[PDB]
Design a protein around this ligand. Structure first.
Ligand code: CUA
Ligand code: CUA
Ligand code: CA
Ligand code: CA
Ligand code: CL
Ligand code: CL
Ligand code: K
Ligand code: K
Ligand code: NA
Ligand code: NA
Lengths: 584, 581
């Protein structure tokens, strides 16, 4: 029976962490499951007024040149793995809007690295190497562009117009390699060995019109032999593009002939999801325009890459007919797959091995249950489904139209992320969770897979550059309350300890570029401070033992108040200071 | 009183949460406490484009340059002391603004930078006869003018001001110069009186200096009298602002016509009007009391019929350590947060008034432990004469161990408490991001929202004017207008296709894309993102939205629909082609 409790009462804790994509809003959200309450927001591609992410020097340093963008579009959150199990170190996420990948450190729940993927447009599909560990982050660039894209050629049928599959080194967050592909790229997953990855393609037609993109009854799943790519990179057998030293391998077909890096497995039709079963047997492609999933036997891939198979379709071992609009698939670890039907507006539960038998002509009932969802589901996620610990307890289906499921709030509606108990034979819908801005996908982890810090380490790399700047000024950040003058630059350093800033007044000249660096020397957990300069667009958080810094121009003469924004003490309202700006 | 709202069931109340330092307003359902929507106000929102779009930046004015805000105090407009559901107003402490949200479309539609002040904190609405004015406190004393010649806060021209904004026009009505400073504010149930707490009666600018006096005050304003001075032209103006400024300071011990200063201990904070209209209740903060000002006595105070401003105080109950804010069940009880004791204290107001006269009565009914360090609290419909005594939310600043660890930054804990009976019962812990300070609840039937946009909506009227000047009919046209180094692309959109799927411009052109969503089905939103240009916006059904960006990169640049709108959403794309210089 499906019977688990969803209520988490006052004083009780959730059993799992949920990491939600922020969708078009650009952040990552931490939820407790099964309460479905949002515990934290982690700013990534958004600018966050509260913490100052996007304003502070530390955050802008992480974002690099891309700190000029105030937007992102996130879809695909994934947690780093060791030996096919979550290791709790990192969360990675895409940015479709400005072509980035970000890394979040799960001990501090902050974005700590970010990369603009070179020579591509729109980072969509993203998933992680599972075994031996997450060495690579694999990311799809969705859109075909010219190379170079310098405005001389615009034609997407040109021989140098393409997109690429991308591998980022997880630990360094520098590029590892790129593989040029035929067609385009939608979603991606990885096997349980480290050798193989796979991605769906919906535009095998290389067409730039809606209808053109649906002409072929089959596109493909493209499979990558990562070992062969790695070998070619070691041999120096690669080109580079634009200004990037990233190794670029060519995985396109040449006059019908396969490269060593890729195989193209025909699959109907504009397929979307690409999901690796938790037993490691299958890459399962969701058929979208075709009312099917296609099951690729991972076991057969070495033979495919060796030329031992007559036809690339020989790796397909199942093509179950499921219903209208299949988009994404997940796993209970009991041998069932669960697939979203966008058009039928359901989740379909189906037995994978039976579908494989059906494909060989046995008459079997692989469909177990169809559950109505509300409405038009996209992704779905079962607890621990990306790991060999898939536990079959909870499932979340993320549906794009909520219609009448919540109180009306105007023309813009929330998404409906529905919690489903899958612990028994029958799926049961237990909670409707409204969410903002279209999280597309989410990922769950056991409470015991995530270990967080209670207060910051003074040596944390997040603010290491600030610590270096201080050293150059002769400043001991744990103690000093000083104003350094450097031409028209002023560098204010202070400690803070509730309810007092360590520097409560300073004076500068109109036009000076002021940097304020604050170290919160409280040691009690949860005593955060803030810093806001009135009417100057200046806001940041400083948590216990953190150093944070922010730069602004003092372009207004007169007296300008600053205050602590984070309620920190009974005397919080009085935790203030004054900047005096002498007229030009 | 059940809190579970199962699948297919709806919440009973709307809750409008302040976003705190994050800058937005959040719409919640109560009692599920689930967040239904976020309304961008002072933040920049990637999803909808608020802060990026032309419509949003027009509303924000010059303050569109700021990417931050600090909001505390959401309030819903009233008619005859009851919510009318038309508007929600909120402060911005960081960049000195007031914003108005239109509740039919759940969008910010007006915003004002309050002139000649620093830090808009306390905010509340006129109740009766209706919300003509929004009252807003500027917290921090500054020089006038603030030109860098005088920094002394003891100067006669160093002060702050109480502010009244016309609710319907969102222009300034008037400002009142006060002694001291201003923290929170409320209004009576007649329209004549408003009141604000002050914590710096000392006009001191060190921590100790600000706590020198046992008593600061509540400043009470005679709004009728202020309006009169403004009508007669008996006002000054400051700097470049035409706003009428009245002087409410004492002069050589003599009262102004506009104000009375009622001494209250100590660095008082909350300032709340009881739902029966009888009292302004000031929370004592550093004093373990609230002070109860009898609104009935204020006309006598302003007429000079009372000997001593303290004669309007009719209760000063001792409640516990760190009282910050008070709310009402409509049954004669007040509920006050004790920040230091970490409790909500339920107390009987009439009994406290009897205790002040020396009767031995225990006006304290219950103290409920909350988790931990509560700031504001809010009982359902407490700001109206319909206060219903059902639900109470206490908004606590430290959550400690009440939720899964998430790192050094913790959520706030907004706790739902059933107050329908004699005994307060804690029912739900709601984690929230970024310190919502206060919140406001409304019955489902007090809010009426639009399902799709009106083509005449003022929100995008300026864009409609731009289109008109170009000869464009937004409901139909798909055209590129060329105008020097400006390019104005106009298109309709209807799932799964943009009306214009390719256009060509020159490197350096300032490109405006205006999109009108001509779907009529509810909930079919589209988006528009230009890859690698930092361009993102929402276009909901029948909305027109527009965005301007520089085509600074030669070559082919994709654009796409960000809002999953149709089975063929991934395919709702286009291409901008940029010719090199
Ligand atoms: Cu520091 Cu509030
Ligand atoms: Cu339009 Cu998705
Ligand atoms: Ca296709
Ligand atoms: Ca004082
Ligand atoms: Cl997928
Ligand atoms: Cl208040
Ligand atoms: K939606
Ligand atoms: K807090
Ligand atoms: Na980087
Ligand atoms: Na305005």
């Amino acid at each position: 029976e499906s019977k688990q409790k969803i209520h988490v009462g006052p004083g009780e804790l959730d059993d799992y962490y949920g990491f939600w994509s922020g969708g078009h809003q650009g952040e990552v959200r931490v939820l407790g499951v099964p309460s479905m309450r949002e515990l934290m927001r982690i700013p990534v591609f958004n600018v966050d007024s509260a913490t100052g992410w996007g304003l502070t020097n530390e955050s802008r340093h992480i974002m690099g040149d891309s700190a000029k963008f105030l937007n992102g579009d996130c879809h695909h959150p994934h947690i780093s793995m060791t030996d096919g199990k979550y290791d709790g170190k990192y969360l990675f996420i895409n940015d479709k809007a400005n072509s980035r990948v970000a890394r979040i450190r799960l001990d501090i729940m902050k974005c700590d690295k970010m990369i603009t993927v070179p020579n591509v447009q729109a980072i969509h599909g993203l998933r992680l190497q599972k075994v031996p560990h997450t060495k690579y982050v694999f990311a799809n660039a969705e859109f075909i562009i010219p190379h170079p894209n310098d405005g001389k050629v615009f034609d997407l049928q040109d021989e140098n117009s393409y997109t690429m599959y991308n591998a980022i080194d997880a630990e360094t967050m520098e590029m590892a390699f790129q593989v040029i592909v035929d067609g385009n790229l939608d979603n991606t997953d990885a096997d349980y060995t480290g050798r193989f990855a796979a991605a769906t393609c919906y535009n095998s037609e290389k067409a730039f019109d809606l209808g053109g993109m649906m002409r072929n009854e089959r596109d493909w799943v493209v499979v990558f032999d990562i070992h062969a790519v790695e070998a070619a990179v070691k041999a120096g057998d690669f080109i580079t593009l634009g200004d990037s030293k990233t190794p670029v391998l060519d995985g396109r077909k040449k006059d019908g002939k396969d490269s060593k890096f890729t195989r193209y497995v025909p699959v109907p039709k504009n397929p979307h999801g690409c999901n690796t079963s938790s037993d490691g047997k299958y890459f399962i492609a969701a058929g979208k325009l075709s009312p099917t999933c296609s099951m690729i036997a991972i076991d057969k891939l070495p033979d495919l890459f060796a030329g031992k198979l007559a036809d690339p379709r020989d790796v397909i071992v199942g093509e179950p007919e499921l219903g209208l609009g299949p988009l994404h698939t997940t796993f209970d670890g009991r041998g069932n797959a669960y697939t979203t039907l966008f058009i039928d507006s359901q989740v379909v539960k189906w037995n994978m091995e039976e579908a494989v038998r059906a494909y060989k002509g046995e008459k079997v009932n692989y469909i177990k249950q169809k559950l109505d969802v509300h409405y038009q589901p996209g992704h779905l996620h079962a607890s621990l489904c990306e790991t060999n610990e898939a536990d079959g307890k909870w499932l979340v289906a993320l549906s794009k139209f909520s219609k009448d499921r919540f109180l009306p709030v105007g023309p813009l509606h929330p998404e409906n992320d529905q919690l489903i108990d899958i612990s028994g034979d029958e799926m049961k819908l237990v909670h409707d969770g409204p969410t903002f801005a279209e999280p597309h996908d989410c990922i769950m982890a056991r409470r015991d897979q995530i270990k967080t810090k209670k207060i910051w380490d003074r040596n944390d790399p997040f603010f290491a550059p600030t610590v270096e700047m201080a050293k150059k000024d002769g400043i001991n950040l744990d103690t000093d309350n000083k104003v350094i003058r450097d031409g028209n630059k002023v560098r204010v350093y202070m400690t803070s300890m509730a309810p007092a800033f360590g520097v409560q007044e300073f004076t500068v000249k109109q036009g000076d570029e002021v940097t304020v660096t604050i170290t919160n020397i409280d040691q009690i957990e949860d005593v955060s401070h803030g810093f806001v300069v009135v009417n100057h667009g200046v806001s940041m958080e400083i948590s216990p033992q953190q150093t944070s810094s922010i730069t602004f121009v003092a372009d207004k003469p007169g007296l300008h108040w600053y205050y602590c924004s984070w309620f920190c003490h009974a005397l919080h309202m009085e935790m203030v200071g004054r900047m005096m700006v002498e007229p030009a």
